[PDB]
Amino acid sequence: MTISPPEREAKAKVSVDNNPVPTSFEKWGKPGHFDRTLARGPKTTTWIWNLHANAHDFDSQTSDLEDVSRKIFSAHFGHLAVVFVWLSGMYFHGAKFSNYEGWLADPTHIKPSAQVVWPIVGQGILNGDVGGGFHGIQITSGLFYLWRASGFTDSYQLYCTAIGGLVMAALMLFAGWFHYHVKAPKLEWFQNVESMMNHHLAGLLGLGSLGWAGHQIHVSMPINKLLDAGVAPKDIPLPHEFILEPSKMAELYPSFAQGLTPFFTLNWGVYSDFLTFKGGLNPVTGGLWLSDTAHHHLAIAVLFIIAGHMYRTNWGIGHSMKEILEAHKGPFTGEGHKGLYEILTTSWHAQLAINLALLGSLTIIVAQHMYAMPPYPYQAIDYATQLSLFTHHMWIGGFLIVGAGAHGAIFMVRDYDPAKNVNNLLDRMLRHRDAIISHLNWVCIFLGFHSFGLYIHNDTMRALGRPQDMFSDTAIQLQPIFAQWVQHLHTLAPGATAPNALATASYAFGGETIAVAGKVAMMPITLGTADFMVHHIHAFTIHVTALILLKGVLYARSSRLVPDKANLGFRFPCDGPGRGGTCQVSGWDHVFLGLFWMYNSLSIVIFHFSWKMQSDVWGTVSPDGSVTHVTLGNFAQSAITINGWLRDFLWAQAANVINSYGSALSAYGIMFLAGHFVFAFSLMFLFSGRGYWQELIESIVWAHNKLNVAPAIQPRALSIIQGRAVGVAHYLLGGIVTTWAFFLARSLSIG
């Protein structure tokens, strides 16, 4: 019994249990309380690791689906509160430790900074001179550009935003506590997938973009209209003045003189001065027209709100997703989607696999769309922000996708019920897993031979003094003619298949060379032989990662080698040295290998992005009109060999990282070496096995017993699974930190 509010249901499907778990601190001092195999306490050091390994494995703690659902819901509230703390921290550092107003007054002669370092042990050198007398660390997160597009002009608004973010974090934390301990919703409530979808479509995504269209129209658009006109930020009215004095809007947008009447009478064209379809970019800032983005958010809101009405809830109108799914079956696929509604309404891991896959794919789509259609003012000219945002979203997407593989496998081991999947899509997938995987295997072999092998052919031909026998734009050509054709279609579209659009959706497809200040923001990104070869590298590495994770899911129950793999679990090291050796058959080990292959794929993607943008897009433009690129168009002739990537990309561009000592970039050289060290360190865990280390520990325990200093909690070597987890965690950390230091030194040292 804690706080007891009235009730708060209004003929709703809301159903809760009051006070199921009392608030108490005792279990805080009882570590491992949630696991029966842990509650008694430790006896060996393994006990510690598993305590962290199983902390969020809510299935393994309780068999009750309702309690698992409640734990998940409150954990989501806690995670949202963490994200709120982080975002308010960003806004606070923008308010109190940034040069934001100074940057806003003159964004072409000052570098954004929002982290000041204290002077100690010499590290004060990291406070590089970023312009206007400001000294700090140059940020590449694009926070300043977002804040300018939103219409921030003052430190006090950022400070108020940070305070609101802290209050929101407190609210989320209290909601998590409240819905686990005070009013915990029943399993019947979570399974209302139709209502949840209606609300997340019309309410979360639809009303979200509607309110943001409101802010963009009333705050972002007039304020940026005045900012780009050269008006000093202090002379611009505050956001609320345009709402108190509507004549300001009306003189910035004459349609406002007519008000809301054109909206309700379907006379929308009157609004054509602030709801636009310009395309292209803003000539002053290099970003997307904010009016275009406001019209975009308005249309997206209408779309999502309409979508939020498909599913039936309390009123007979709408769809049952179970019915729809059951109706989709064909002569090739047995019972079709029968059973999918029951799977996705009783299995958290199935939902999480779907959602991880789609959210990772979306994060990648975000990187790809934001680089070529730069949405924020002055982001495209800031090549460091451009590179950093692209690569960051890439990595997040890749990790989410690999997690999707993990949770497909966990579904197969823990929630798949064969009596509920008789001759449906999942069952037939299991029943021809061999065809699927043997073919994916062969496609990967073909894609590797005919992508990487082309590079090896070129390296060997060039070394043999035989340039005319290479795959290149000047020899044996591999032109990507379909991508060229679609680029041409996009360039012709404003005048034919997109009449009411003035410019292209993106200048990468072709057209003018948009440059702000002396640097190009965007220009046609042409595609040739090297681009063909690297796109097939991408297809190859993606296919191999998919091969690994899909094999992990489809064989998690069994294989010809191990027909009872399901009984062994999702996470386990092997089934012994027998059958020739069965190490790494688990779904967890497939995730473990897919991590490395995803890292490979994304490393190549981001290297391709960096080199192609530095060679053929980015650069400085003379007042005569001509363009001079950062790496002088070297991609076409150098990216067609492995030696070209080793010398003209890695070797040439690493000069900034390795010479960073003695300047504000010194920390990037430090972390370059740091990533290298962590990568090398991971090889100890990956190339060895725990038996050797357990024996070494035996000798060291003898040393301790000799002086009567051996611990009661006996030291054990890491488990096989944990050895692999540590190895891969360190491999990814070291390699990614290496590339991060490299990229930041490079993109910050190239104008």
């Binding site: 001092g29 570590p31 306490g41 430790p42 006896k43 510690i48 002077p119 100690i120 042990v121 010499g122 004060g124 050198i125 035996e698 003898w702 017993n705 000799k706 002086l707 009567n708 200093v709 611990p711 009661a712 909690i713």
Partner: protein, 143 residues
Amino acid sequence: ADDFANLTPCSENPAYLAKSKNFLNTTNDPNSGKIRAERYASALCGPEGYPHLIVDGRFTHAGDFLIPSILFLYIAGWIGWVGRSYLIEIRESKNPEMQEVVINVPLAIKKMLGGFLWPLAAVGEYTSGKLVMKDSEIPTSPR
């Protein structure tokens, strides 16, 4: 006599003098570089102008290793001795693993505060037979 001829005093070394006129400020004190120059002008520099530490054991360079060595050893013996003492004391408490994982703050602080006498404590445990164990009473693996 002419020992360490390959090196010269930093106050003699002209490269050190040129670089020390440019010693950066490591803290907020606008004199940190100047204090550093004055302080390091006492060591032995090399042709490049950086100080070189002599650790062969001569007391004229005792501050280059001997004094920090003594200091570290006192502190490290302190840490190890109080840790071992707490580890011993837990063993008589029925469930020692829990107090290894959930620390007995009062007992551990009592043990930590009494560590400044760890050399004499270790000598006493050596003479009394508490420090070292016998071979025939320690578990070993097959040979």
